[model samples]
Target: MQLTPFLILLRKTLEQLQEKDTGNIFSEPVPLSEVPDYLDHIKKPMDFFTMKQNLEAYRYLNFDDFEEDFNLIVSNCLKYNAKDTIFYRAAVRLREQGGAVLRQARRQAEKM
Candidate 1:
């Protein structure tokens, strides 16, 4: 249940794309030769069930902290055929409330 591999591959793939310098995709371009080094340092994506478990772990985090992961996981939830579960629906609601609380906290922090 770990996304480290997927995250690593995703990051490296994006880095590789930016290195192509095809356009204004990224501010700083990575060198093409560095692809080997980047690949050497990164992990790959995991199995479906494992990825689901890893993503599920993020559900308990504060909404602000979990927002990006939540978005990613929710999209995959349907892929995993888990969108109709009671827990999934409840988690969605929790994330919604968490997002609201997170916004309020951020606004309060800005005022302070």
Candidate 2:
């Protein structure tokens, strides 16, 4: 079967995620040059743009993989930034919205 519907879901979901991003903090990769220690700290960095790239490349072999990447992005932020910071708070907000998409997707999938 064609993955057209799932692709649209993911692409639209990503757009929403990017739109809700605070100050575009989660829109792109965190510059390693500015925060060189990022690699050392955030062992597996993930971002909206990269996920979209992976989506386009058919790298995400399944829905769970997509969910995993989304979780990684938020967790990485929470892991690197302190709890009292904007990044941390932003992670929290994104997380709530993360569950939002996952839930909606599951319900939609059930109908299909």
Candidate 3:
């Protein structure tokens, strides 16, 4: 299923988490291949605001620095009706704050 580039980045991050010696990786793998099912089965996160608050570090990623990457992913998601895709979620997570939830999720998905 030709994965989107954004998904690729997301999956790459997960795989990295899985390799950490710290052993804080999520109890399971990143579930990259199972994203559709996982997205379906996984409950929408409830502590979104709290996560956003804590994820302010990503604000350092200036949009100008990643605008091309951002537009590509956003456009691709729009084309595929992937509004709920992790990329979209991550974008929002990053956009809402400086640190952003993606970084927070990665931290939680890994060990310090």
Best by TM-score: 2
Q: In model 2, which range of ten residues has the least summed lDDT?
A: 103-112
Best by lDDT: 2
TM-score for each candidate, following the candidate numbering: 0.31, 0.91, 0.22
Summarize candidate 2's per-residue lDDT along 19-109 as a digit string, tens digits: 7785888878999889888987777899998999999998875678888999998999999999999889999999998789777876775
Q: Give the lowest summed-lDDT range of ten residues in model 1.
A: 21-30
Model 2 spans > 4 angstroms off: none
lDDT of each: 0.38, 0.84, 0.36
Which runs in model 3 stand beyond 4 Å of their true positions?
Answer: 1-3, 21-25, 29-112
Measured by TM-score, how close is model 3 to the native structure?
Answer: 0.22
Candidate 1: where are CA atoms >4 Å away? 1-81
Per-residue lDDT of 56 in model 2: 98
**Which digits, one per residue and each the tens of the lDDT, describe model 1 over residues 1-112?**
2445434433343233223323321222223374345334223312223333444564322324333543433333323335787535644654455355446544543443
Instruction: After the best TM-score superposition of candidate 1, give how far the Cα of residue 56 lies from its true spot, in angstroms.
Output: 22
Candidate 1 is scored at a TM of 0.31
**lDDT (Cα, tens digit) per residue for candidate 3, span 42-68:** 333212222223224342132232233
Which order, best to worst by TM-score? Answer: 2, 1, 3
Instruction: Please state every model's RMSD to the true fold in angstroms.
Output: 18.1, 1.4, 15.1
